[PDB]
Amino acid sequence: SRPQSTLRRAITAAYRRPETECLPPLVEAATQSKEIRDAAASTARKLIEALRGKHSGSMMGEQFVTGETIREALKRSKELEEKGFSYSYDMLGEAATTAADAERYYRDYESAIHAIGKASAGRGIYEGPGISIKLSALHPRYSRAQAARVMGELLPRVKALALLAKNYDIGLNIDAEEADRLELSLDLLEVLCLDGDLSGWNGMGFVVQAYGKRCPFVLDFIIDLARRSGRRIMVRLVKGAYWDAEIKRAQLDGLADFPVFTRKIHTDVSYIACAAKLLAATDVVFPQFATHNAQTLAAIYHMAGKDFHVGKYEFQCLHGMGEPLYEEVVGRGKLDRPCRIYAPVGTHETLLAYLVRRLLENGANSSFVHRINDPKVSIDELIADPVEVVR
Amino acid sequence: QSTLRRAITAAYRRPETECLPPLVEAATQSKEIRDAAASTARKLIEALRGKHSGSGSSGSMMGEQFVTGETIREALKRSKELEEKGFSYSYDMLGEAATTAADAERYYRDYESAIHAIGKASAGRGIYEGPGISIKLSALHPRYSRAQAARVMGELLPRVKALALLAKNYDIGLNIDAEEADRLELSLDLLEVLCLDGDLSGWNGMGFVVQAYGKRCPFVLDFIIDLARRSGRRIMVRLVKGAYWDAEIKRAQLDGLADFPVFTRKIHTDVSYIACAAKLLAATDVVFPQFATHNAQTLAAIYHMAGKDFHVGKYEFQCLHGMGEPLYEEVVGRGKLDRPCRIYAPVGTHETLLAYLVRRLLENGANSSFVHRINDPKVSIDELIADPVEVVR
Ligand SMILES: Cc1cc2nc3c(=O)[nH]c(=O)nc-3n(C[C@H](O)[C@H](O)[C@H](O)COP(=O)(O)OP(=O)(O)OC[C@H]3O[C@@H](n4cnc5c(N)ncnc54)[C@H](O)[C@@H]3O)c2cc1C
Ligand SMILES: Cc1cc2nc3c(=O)[nH]c(=O)nc-3n(C[C@H](O)[C@H](O)[C@H](O)COP(=O)(O)OP(=O)(O)OC[C@H]3O[C@@H](n4cnc5c(N)ncnc54)[C@H](O)[C@@H]3O)c2cc1C
Ligand SMILES: C#CCSCC(=O)O
Ligand SMILES: C#CCSCC(=O)O
């Protein structure tokens, strides 16, 4: 059969599979024992009470950017690195419209890797800083051009950045963008992981969005790719940043079934099911659990069990959103688990698209970060396991 | 179809370089007016920079700064303080782009109940001294942007007419907000039908927004001024720059168009606004101009362009709740410029607030926005009082 026929067919079949059909296997995989659920509720309660206790109970988003340049961002990272946080730097900029813009973004990433690699100073991919890139920044027609043209021009660029990251032994993560570019980005991940020029480096990383119906099947493909390539792929599990745009796009596409879930707790169930899959594959992937939701965090912390070492998995958060929560996580007296801060770098000329996504995240009534400040939402509701709502 | 309607259609994607010469000419003020406006603008900006207005005051992503109240009852109670200072209100029941019939029905009921509450609170103060309402057509039809324009207008007309009839019963203003460029024509057709509908005779509260970032703006205004004159309706015309610029650019880039329906340089929108303000100020007999802006230079220019004669009902300024108060506290009142300002006042929950908040973020966060520049240490007062006609190059 075609290479990985079964795994690839499962991804395509899930693309727009009816939401009601996607959920039952996720619910089962996300169901944890009463004893674990009780312990997780206690941890989530503590995290929420501590969050408010230490923070007395901005739209312009200056708090979301770590620096205007990589040199400035690296200087401002020393304090939290001393405490046990790590960083992933994001040179802001996406959706290049011209070939010249794509070349400028490439050069920004290239210079950033040199600076980050020098700052890392041999700390390696888990304890030291890394970089995150967006494929839409590196091809001028990313959303519109045929995959053959995008691949043939994007692959040499991404390979070159990955080689530089290998040379400094830092992480290089491909951020996940709109649903219609998942397939191309995954094909690119495969080619890079099988490229012998990158052998010996486990810093290649890839995001999977749990609001997407394909998420568990993409994870199956990635875990199998790790096994056959010999690369321990860093896998950032997120819920997803483009929900409002995906809903609008699917409506304008005339779709009867969308590529993302439309009930928020379904995304939560999907995230926990996929975390269970990742936690069973830590021999071949490095799970990175990106979330600001204290209930999600506590559920994964207890799911992962008592055995931990740095390099087994980590949590992640966004700069300007997650530090209060993760100050109750990192460190021996807390949960003794590491957290990597995603750290945007740039100016107003490149901040807009990201800030809009942060407003849609922070301003939505369904978001944990909004509900924690909502007087109508009890602590009981914040710590409730969403899997029990649909079980 | 008419010569005036044809001028609108022909301008839709007219090349930007062709649109500008007539706007530059119309936006050119005499030296005496320019000097007076520079003096007024400098005074306003010096006062603003003694305050802490602009984008830095936008508050948190909870959006608390931008919503007047959760219900119309709450919002009406909170309006008494600023009403006696010389402000009026236009209440906006938040909600837009209905996707289902149930949503469009809920938004209709929200608007209807707001009109009853606002009209009762107005207590016969009329359309200028008393509060009004603003509506979005996309809230009232479940496929506003995705269905054929003719059929959309036909189902929308009875609903908007029913709301207009309630507004007439209480003698309050009812304004149709302007949304995306591809729906200007439909909304303008609806306005014309309403203004020729004898059931609405004797009421001057029908209002309509025109966006100066659009290439059709002056020709829309010519059509509306003529419609007011021939129908006997003193149409309330809210002149804005526009709230959807980033989305219009993105759609136009995807549509593969060489020529967009909006200007692409901020200074061109500024020139367009001043040119269109000149057109409106020449037509105060038949339309009620409402100059919506937070830009102190724009305001000062219009204040001097309007001349010395003023009475309530001639024209007004407008601002958004949570953005315009620092500026307009230097405008309303007998100790200031003695001109009225109507506050656009969103009313709703956090849920219905999100889309409006995104447009406020794009407005407040853009380096090109007056409200961002007023707080920017790199931007001089000299730059803030520059006349757009004298800068454009
Ligand atoms: C370090 C880091 C890196 C990230 N990288 C990426 C990336 O590369 N690509 C990407 O797309 N996202 C990425 N994200 C995720 C995104 O930016 C949000 O931070 C994240 O989705 C919020 O989830 P949460 O668990 O913190 O919050 P929660 O409040 O628990 O979850 C909110 C999320 O639920 C989802 N949602 C909301 N409403 C609905 C609904 N009606 N139906 C279904 N789902 C709904 C959305 O995904 C929303 O963001 C990243 C996040 C972090 C912290
Ligand atoms: C009471 C009130 C009601 C309003 N109602 C509506 C409405 O119904 N519909 C609507 O669309 N808008 C409406 N607006 C306008 C919108 O919400 C903004 O408030 C307004 O455009 C900002 O203009 P300004 O003069 O305050 O600021 P300025 O800083 O002087 O102008 C900013 C504006 O310039 C324009 N712009 C920015 N960059 C560019 C560029 N590169 N090229 C071209 N133009 C550019 C945009 O329109 C932007 O909002 C309303 C505004 C107010 C105050
Ligand atoms: C968060 C993150 C990384 S990708 C989506 C975004 O930039 O918002
Ligand atoms: C402002 C205003 C009225 S219409 C556009 C928007 O709601 O942002």
Option in B62, B146, B365 nearest A60 (CB):
B365
Q: Give the alpha-carbon dihedral of B213, B389, B227, B94, to 10 degrees.
A: 30
- Candidates B52, B57, B60, B61: best to mutate against A (most CBs of A within 10 A) is B61
In the DSSP assignment, the letter for residue A137 is G
H or E element in which residue B161 lies: helix B149-170
Q: What is residue B218's three-state secondary structure?
A: helix
> Measuring CA to CA, how many Å separate B3 from each of B185, B187, B232?
15, 18, 20
H or E element in which residue B21 lies: helix B16-27
Tokens found for residue B255: 């549509």
Name the minimum distance, in Å, from the CA of B106 to any CA of chain A. 19
Q: How far is the CA of B341 from the centre of ligand 4 (A)?
A: 17
Which residues in B lie closer than 8 A to residue A144 (C-beta atoms)? 254
Q: Quick check: A363 and B61 CB within 8 A?
A: yes
Cβ B164 vs Cβ B174: under 8 Å? yes
C-alpha A218/C-alpha B331 separation (Å) is 60
Chain gaps in chain B, named by the residue before each (C–N > 2.5 Å): none
Full 3-state SS string of A182-240: HHHHHHHHHHHHCCHHHCCCCCEEEEEECCECCHHHHHHHHHHHHHHHCCCEEEEEECC
Q: Give the alpha-carbon dihedral of A264, A270, A271, A272, to 10 degrees.
A: 120
Name the minimum distance, in Å, from the CA of B241 to any CA of chain A. 20
Cβ B132 vs Cβ B173: under 8 Å? yes
Asked whether B245 lines ligand 4 (CB < 6 A), one says no
Option in B55, B351, B358 nearest A359 (CB):
B358
Number of neighbours of residue A169 by Cβ within 10 angstroms: 18
Closest chain B residue to A252, measured at CA: B146
> Measuring CA to CA, how many Å separate A284 from each of A86, A223, A255, A281, A311?
21, 7, 36, 6, 11
C-alpha B210/C-alpha A30 separation (Å) is 52
Which residues in B lie closer than 8 A to residue A360 (C-beta atoms)? 354, 358
C-alpha B290/C-alpha B178 separation (Å) is 14
C-alpha B357/C-alpha B59 separation (Å) is 11
Cβ A386 vs Cβ A371: under 8 Å? no
Q: Quick check: B361 and A59 CB within 8 A?
A: yes
Beta strands A339-345 and A314-318 are: parallel
Q: Quick check: A58 and B55 CB within 8 A?
A: no
Cβ B372 vs Cβ B54: under 8 Å? yes
In the DSSP assignment, the letter for residue A22 is H
C-alpha A217/C-alpha A231 separation (Å) is 19
C-alpha B68/C-alpha B81 separation (Å) is 13
C-alpha B390/C-alpha B393 separation (Å) is 8
Q: How far is the CA of B243 from the centre of ligand 2 (A)?
A: 5
Look up tokens 């795994």; give the residue: A7
Residue B234 main-chain phi, psi, to 5 deg? -85, 85
C-alpha A284/C-alpha A280 separation (Å) is 10
C-alpha A326/C-alpha A334 separation (Å) is 9
Residue A156, judged by CB atoms within 10 A of its CB (0-12, 13-18, 19+), counts as exposed
Q: Where are the alpha helices (DSSP H) in chain A?
A: 5-14, 19-30, 34-53, 70-75, 78-83, 99-120, 124-127, 147-168, 182-193, 215-229, 243-252, 264-279, 294-303, 323-326, 348-363, 368-371, 379-383, 387-390
Residue B338, judged by CB atoms within 10 A of its CB (0-12, 13-18, 19+), counts as exposed
CB-facing half-sphere around the CA of A212: CA atoms within 13 A = 28
Q: What is residue A35's three-state secondary structure?
A: helix
Strand partners, A90: A132, A344
Look up tokens 């480096």; give the residue: A201
Residues 6+ apart with CB under 8 A from B131: B76, B79, B88, B89, B90, B91, B118, B121, B122, B125, B172, B173
Tokens found for residue B256: 């593969």
A56: contact with B, CB 8 A cutoff: no
Q: How far is the CA of A175 from the centre of ligand 3 (A)?
A: 7
Buried (b) or exposed (e) across A23-38, using 16+ Cβ within 10 A? Answer: beebbebbbbeeebbe
Cβ A233 vs Cβ A188: under 8 Å? no
Provide the domain count of chain B.
1
Number of neighbours of residue A83 by Cβ within 10 angstroms: 12
Binding residues of B: 178, 211, 238, 241-243, 245, 264, 266, 293-295, 360, 363, 368, 370
Residue A342 main-chain phi, psi, to 5 deg? -80, 120
B58: contact with A, CB 8 A cutoff: yes
Which residues in A lie closer than 8 A to residue B361 (C-beta atoms)? 59, 355-356, 359
Cβ B193 vs Cβ B231: under 8 Å? no
C-alpha B248/C-alpha B265 separation (Å) is 13
Interface size between A and B, measured as CB pairs under 8 A = 64
The amino acid that residue A115 corresponds to is A
**Greatest alpha-carbon span in chain B:** 56
The amino acid that residue B280 corresponds to is L
CB-facing half-sphere around the CA of A123: CA atoms within 13 A = 18
Q: What angle do CA B379, B384, B385 make, to 5 degrees?
A: 150
C-alpha B33/C-alpha B303 separation (Å) is 10
Q: Quick check: A97 and B56 CB within 8 A?
A: no
Q: How far is the CA of A206 from the centre of ligand 3 (A)?
A: 13
Which residues in A lie closer than 8 A to residue B246 (C-beta atoms)? 352
Cβ A304 vs Cβ A279: under 8 Å? yes
H or E element in which residue A174 lies: strand A172-174
Atom of ligand 1 nearest to the CA of A261: 43
CATH number of B365's domain: 3.20.20.220
Orientation angle between helical segments A348-363 and B350-365, nearest 10 degrees: 170
Q: Resolution in A for the shown PDB structure?
A: 1.4
Cβ A259 vs Cβ A279: under 8 Å? no
A358: contact with B, CB 8 A cutoff: yes
Tokens found for residue B15: 């090349």
Cβ B243 vs Cβ B359: under 8 Å? yes
Buried (b) or exposed (e) across A325-335, using 16+ Cβ within 10 A? Answer: bbbbbbbeeeb
H or E element in which residue B317 lies: strand B316-320
Number of neighbours of residue B3 by Cβ within 10 angstroms: 9
Which ligand neighbours the alpha carbon of B353 most closely?
4
Option in A349, A352, A360 nearest B354 (CB):
A360
Tally of residues, chain B: 393
Q: How far is the CA of B389 from the centre of ligand 4 (A)?
A: 27
A6: contact with B, CB 8 A cutoff: no
The amino acid that residue B9 corresponds to is T
Q: How far is the CA of A59 from the centre of ligand 2 (A)?
A: 18
Q: Which domain holds residue B309?
A: 3-390
Residues 6+ apart with CB under 8 A from B226: B4
Q: What is residue A372's three-state secondary structure?
A: coil
Tokens found for residue A61: 């988003």
> Measuring CA to CA, how many Å separate A270 from each of A36, A386, B170?
18, 10, 53
Tokens found for residue B128: 């200028």
Cβ A346 vs Cβ A68: under 8 Å? yes
Tokens found for residue A329: 């996580």
In a domain, A127, yes or no: yes
C-alpha B221/C-alpha B228 separation (Å) is 10
Which ligand neighbours the alpha carbon of A91 most closely?
3
Tokens found for residue B144: 């506003």
C-alpha A134/C-alpha A252 separation (Å) is 25
